[PDB]
């Protein structure tokens, strides 16, 4: 809790759905947003901060709260958009040999700034005396170890708590989330959403020699006609859907009502039947 990691993770597809099956978590209360909509929001970089506290202290981890650990080791303001993911770790972090390794900084002068790590080991000076290093009646060790033992009960067990602070500065967002895909349909007028490029057309097989860096493709006069498959390399062609004009030939509503329908721009195989120029 006095020296916690600050892992800056970015440039990946943050799939939070996988975290629901990695370890048997006991608390997944995200205060900022919902996990369903979290996978569809881009971010620049996530700050992962992990620590270990007791079971009765997990409630102290909240966006604004006082306590022996809430305002002395790690404080969260009223803007945390991440989660409070935490899980019990009383399977490998509890042996009967003396657990004098951890600490929680029982002594302090005032509340620390939120989202701050104070890595210090000086002797706590309780005023009215210059303590150049002494341990008696005026200046003591500001650190105290826990008493984690395997043969205990719930509430005072080693609980690993990890928070994921989010930020959105004036920087391009890298971590967006999972990007699913669908099956390919060829020779059929359907819709497409290829890498933001949305539209409709008939994905056909072309014979164009695209450059190894080009992705999209236009025509003589401002019309996208071919794109590169985001999957394995394949050259496609996006031709517009089946469209045309319709005209009605009618001898007039004075002798009969039989009419003829002329579809312009079609070879009678895309709608007696006759094919004219």
């Amino acid at each position, epitope marked *: 809790v006095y020296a916690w990691n600050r892992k800056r993770i970015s440039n990946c597809v943050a799939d939070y759905s996988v975290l629901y099956n990695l370890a048997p978590f006991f608390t997944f209360k995200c205060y900022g947003v919902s996990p369903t909509k979290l996978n569809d929001l881009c971010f620049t970089n996530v700050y992962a901060d992990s620590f270990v506290i*007791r079971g*009765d*202290e997990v*409630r*102290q981890i909240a966006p604004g709260q*006082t*306590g*022996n650990i809430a*305002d*002395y080791n790690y404080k969260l303001p009223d803007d945390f958009t991440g989660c409070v993911i935490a899980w019990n770790s009383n399977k490998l972090d509890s042996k009967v040999s003396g657990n004098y390794n951890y600490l929680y900084r*029982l*002594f*302090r*002068k*005032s*509340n620390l700034k939120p989202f701050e790590r104070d890595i210090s080991t000086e002797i706590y000076q*309780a*005023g*009215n005396k210059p303590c150049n290093g002494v341990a*008696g*009646f*005026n200046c*003591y060790f500001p650190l*105290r170890s*826990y*008493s984690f033992r395997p*043969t*205990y*009960g719930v*509430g*005072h067990q080693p609980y690993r708590v990890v928070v994921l602070s989010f930020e959105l500065l004036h920087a391009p967002a890298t971590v967006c989330g999972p990007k699913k895909s669908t099956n390919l349909v060829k020779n059929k007028c359907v819709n497409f959403n290829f890498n933001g490029l949305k539209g409709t057309g008939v994905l056909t097989e072309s014979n164009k020699k695209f450059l190894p860096f080009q992705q999209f493709g236009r025509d003589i006069a401002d019309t996208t006609d071919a794109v590169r498959d985001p999957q394995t390399l394949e050259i496609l062609d996006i031709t517009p859907c089946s469209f045309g004009g319709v005209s009605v030939i009618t001898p007039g509503t004075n002798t009969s009502n039989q009419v003829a329908v002329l579809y312009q721009g079609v070879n009678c195989t895309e709608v007696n039947v006759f094919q004219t120029r």
Partner: single-chain antibody, 236 residues
């Protein structure tokens, strides 16, 4: 709520071995069970804080091992003339007051801190029911603005209980008895630290004690120094 024997007078100093049962657990986390010897008149004095390593005092009271689910403080062979009350502390859970126990009469016979830092109070004689009276414990020695102090009240017959806990500079937790009607306000950071009544509900007649150290999360703090209390004497 803890379990303590009402009285203990048979076999003085041979098989007394008082304790405090009713825990049904492993004392939560840090196993630190303190023992307070409340004496009529002056303020109580600390006797032992851990299961071993007794502080500077009488060396005939030690071996406070935790047997079963209770700390059995070995008191046999101490003396045969004492009139006081032994109180034990447990239940160190997060934000849980009333850690003291009931009145245990450990009088083996029945019939037969002063200049350390400072000891001052307000002297609330004939307190009017209500209003706002301030009580201070100005200490010219240890800093009254950096250490973790507490306020504990006790009434005739009833035992002690946690009434006010205040951390270094960022916590103002109140007990469950007041439930909000008590507001702690710190005085100047270099003069003293006083309290506030804030319209008592006729239950604040108990005498107060401003301790320089915590009770349940007690630290060594060099030495445990207490101060005499004053009678409220409400006239509601």
């Amino acid at each position: 709520v803890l379990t303590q024997p009402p009285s203990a007078s048979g076999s003085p100093g041979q098989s007394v071995t008082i304790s405090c049962t009713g825990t049904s657990s492993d004392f939560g986390g840090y196993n630190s069970v303190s023992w307070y010897q409340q004496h009529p008149g002056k303020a109580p004095k600390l006797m032992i804080y851990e299961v071993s390593k007794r502080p500077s005092g009488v060396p005939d009271r030690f071996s406070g091992s935790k047997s079963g689910n209770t700390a059995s403080l070995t008191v046999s062979g101490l003396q045969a003339e004492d009139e006081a009350d032994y109180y034990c502390s447990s239940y160190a859970g997060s934000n849980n007051f009333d850690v003291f126990g009931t009145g245990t009469k450990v009088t083996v016979l029945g019939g037969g801190g002063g200049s350390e830092v400072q000891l001052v109070e307000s002297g609330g004689g004939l307190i009017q029911p209500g209003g706002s009276l301030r009580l201070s414990c100005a200490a010219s020695g240890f800093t009254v603005s950096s250490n973790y102090m507490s306020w504990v009240r006790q009434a005739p017959g009833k035992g002690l209980e946690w009434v006010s806990v205040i951390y270094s500079g960022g916590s103002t937790y109140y007990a469950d008895s007041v439930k909000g009607r008590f507001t702690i306000s710190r005085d100047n950071s270099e003069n003293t630290l006083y309290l506030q009544m804030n319209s008592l509900r006729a239950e604040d007649t108990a005498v107060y004690y401003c301790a320089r150290g915590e009770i349940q999360p007690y630290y060594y703090y060099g030495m445990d120094v207490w101060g005499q209390g004053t009678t409220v004497t409400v006239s509601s």
